[PDB]
Amino acid sequence: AKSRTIGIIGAPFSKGQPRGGVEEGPTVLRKAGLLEKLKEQECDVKDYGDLPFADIPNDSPFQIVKNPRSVGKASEQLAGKVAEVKKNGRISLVLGGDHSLAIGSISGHARVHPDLGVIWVDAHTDINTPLTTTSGNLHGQPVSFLLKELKGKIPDVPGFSWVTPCISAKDIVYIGLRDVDPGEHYILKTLGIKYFSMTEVDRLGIGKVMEETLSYLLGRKKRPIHLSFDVDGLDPSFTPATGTPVVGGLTYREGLYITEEIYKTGLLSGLDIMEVNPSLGKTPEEVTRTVNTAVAITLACFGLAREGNHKPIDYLN
């Protein structure tokens, strides 16, 4: 139909995050059979192949930002590919990798629909700046490049010349924040970004939280929704095989729930599954739980609802 029409983009890129090993992100999610587990319900699945990530050998660092140009080239390439698959009328399933790719994943999505919304389900806001981080790791600076209210204040870090900030600060909702460095929360409070952290998640209940999140984004006007989803935003009892595990995340139930509310609007238009890392599970059973979690999250995004999915013929026959 309109929804569950999928363009898969595997993006094995790592150089935004330091723990090398997330480049077996799309490989493990595909060998866990995400394609065929879509194909039971009416999923128009078209794999577009993995993106080539060239290696700039002299990707010389910035002041704090390190590996900048590889990240910027990867996200520009992904912005072109996301714009391609959104001109294909599909829902962009862009899975990596790391949050560095979400720059172009939101950018190329805005190249077709400039008035979308971003549900950034993550343990962290990932809105550090190149100037006021202390890491310089670009797996936590995608959102700072994308907000128009931050323009004139973001440095011209190389690789990011193509970057146009494309989303508004009032057009993004964080859900499941649980570890924020101080620069990101000043940005969070000064821009007036609406957010439901694990405080507000527990306060309203996850259902009233998704109710008010859809009342904030879609309560004004129907518009495309871009669920960009980290897998450390869930609790590390379910996904310990991630890059930055922080205890106290969402239960696996509620992660599936957030995806199902985004489905039952019928307005899912872009999906990111980042920070999957099979190299950091202490046992392969940890990796198995993590990858089965992220697969079933992606299933419940496109309408593998826990209520049921059907084909409209009589089955008493």
Place this chain on the structure above:
Amino acid sequence: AKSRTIGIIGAPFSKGQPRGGVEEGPTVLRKAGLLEKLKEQECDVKDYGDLPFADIPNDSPFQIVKNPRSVGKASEQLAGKVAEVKKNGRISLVLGGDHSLAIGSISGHARVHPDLGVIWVDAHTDINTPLTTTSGNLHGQPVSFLLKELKGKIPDVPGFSWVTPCISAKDIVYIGLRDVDPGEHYILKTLGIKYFSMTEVDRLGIGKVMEETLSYLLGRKKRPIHLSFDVDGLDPSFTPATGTPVVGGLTYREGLYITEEIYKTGLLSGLDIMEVNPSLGKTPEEVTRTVNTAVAITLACFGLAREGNHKPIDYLN
């Protein structure tokens, strides 16, 4: 600011509880870096050192109550030190240890603010009497010394001469009770204490529970709040390295949530982290999960909120 201004009081005392080993309570919480993990956000941290616990050699037992005078001397000493750090205008971070210390921890807090409230987050009520317990262990009788409605009925057990009951039965809320011996629940029902056990926690949802808890304590009038927090009140999947583990506790998410609601009133005025015991984890990984849990609980008390914490300067610079 007003909140996140911390006076740390380590209190390595054990003789209220039988399982010796909780006297490495403040040692492990400090070597897990609770001080420095406060110091990112605006935490005025002033360590006041550990309290000396002298050993009464002939601490002769009562009828059922055993090691009474060491508990009473420790809690009187702690009542003086809590009154000292509350005259310092800070929020009393008193971490042990065991719930025997919470006598003086609520008493010295009432010596400055006589009309406070107690959020006793614990698996147990810990309101046995010296007469109608069957243990006689003073890690479960602090609340019976402190309620004015129980006066004329508490024995003059030695060491407890200084004890003035200081809080009202309508001024205390239990959250997360899950194993109560019969004497404590008769006290609980006859005094008309408001409480939200894991029944009522699941009934309202943890957010509506904290909503009605703040509506019960602060809905009448703004007043100081004394979160006295056990670490067995959470589920032993997260803290198995405690003294009395009972299955069915709060999720680690919801424990962090209860602390964050107490923060976002801006009225946190006293904090207890008791029953941490590194000696009872079957693996050191169990101890590691338990201590990281209790540390991040203490962080989310003083406003390491999961939404974010900031310093008010522009970070796009």
Place this chain on the structure above:
Amino acid sequence: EIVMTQSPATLSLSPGERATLSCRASQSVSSYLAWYQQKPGQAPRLLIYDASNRATGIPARFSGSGSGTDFTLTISSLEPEDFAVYYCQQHSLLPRTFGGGTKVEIKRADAAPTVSIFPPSSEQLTSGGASVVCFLNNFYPKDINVKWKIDGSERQNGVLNSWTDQDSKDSTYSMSSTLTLTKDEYERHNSYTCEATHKTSTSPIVKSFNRNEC
């Protein structure tokens, strides 16, 4: 367990030109590894931080490259203080394996070993042991095998070979053929032999003694 393989196992180059070294990965480490300077009995200090870029107290000459399977360690201005066992070490895969060993020796003119063979003392024979050790001395390069014989019939299980580093001044090497026997086995035989074999030794250097000869 990605195995990191260092293609120069040993190295002996004079104070002088480039000393380009090689370290290979079994996967794509992809510009995520380092280079070290383990002097004997010391701190294996960092040379090169992330396949390049020369960390924080590095002198002048320690460039290197990679990205991403078979990497380089260039020592362009050799500087003879740098004679140490070098290590590459992959990092961004668990568990984090190491290289094998890159012993950077001194290149000099091949020295011949001075070889002779030595009995047990009477002070030892009053204690009841036998320790017949041959003593090899001032040679280059390292490799010598020394054979022993029970008056013509070979020996092991006492025989131990142990080598030092290269010397500071004359830049030579080391071995004792540390062999231990019993006093009873000592007294039953006389002609105790030590057969050295070095590259400089065209013939295998045999030095011998009879018991009760010295």
Place this chain on the structure above:
Amino acid sequence: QVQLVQSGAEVKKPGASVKVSCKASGYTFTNYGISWVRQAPGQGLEWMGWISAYNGNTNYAQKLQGRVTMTTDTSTSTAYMELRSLRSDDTAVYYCAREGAYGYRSPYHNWFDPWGQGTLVTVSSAKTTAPSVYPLAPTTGSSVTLGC
């Protein structure tokens, strides 16, 4: 400058462990992360565990899970590593170094830049004893060495 002062060379039988003191200085601590690596003499080297000093992330290695424990002490910038069920394969020099914290506020680091001086640990249950010196030193060679 950026260092690691370790402590200290110690031998254990197969029994209790060597909590190796790995004292840091120079660089700001909990902006980075300290790991551990064994080296038996005449062998290669095996990394054996890395903690972030940022927040207690244990992250041990294969074949010892289990056997290793690693904590922080971040009052003083030291970090520690014990062991459990010790064994005569662990006759190894234990080095600690700084992998950088792989958290979120911590700078890009892949490369072990403090290195500590080492810790001589041989897991042997023998008794500490005096040596026993057994030479001789004085049959046609002009070159006559000697030794013990």
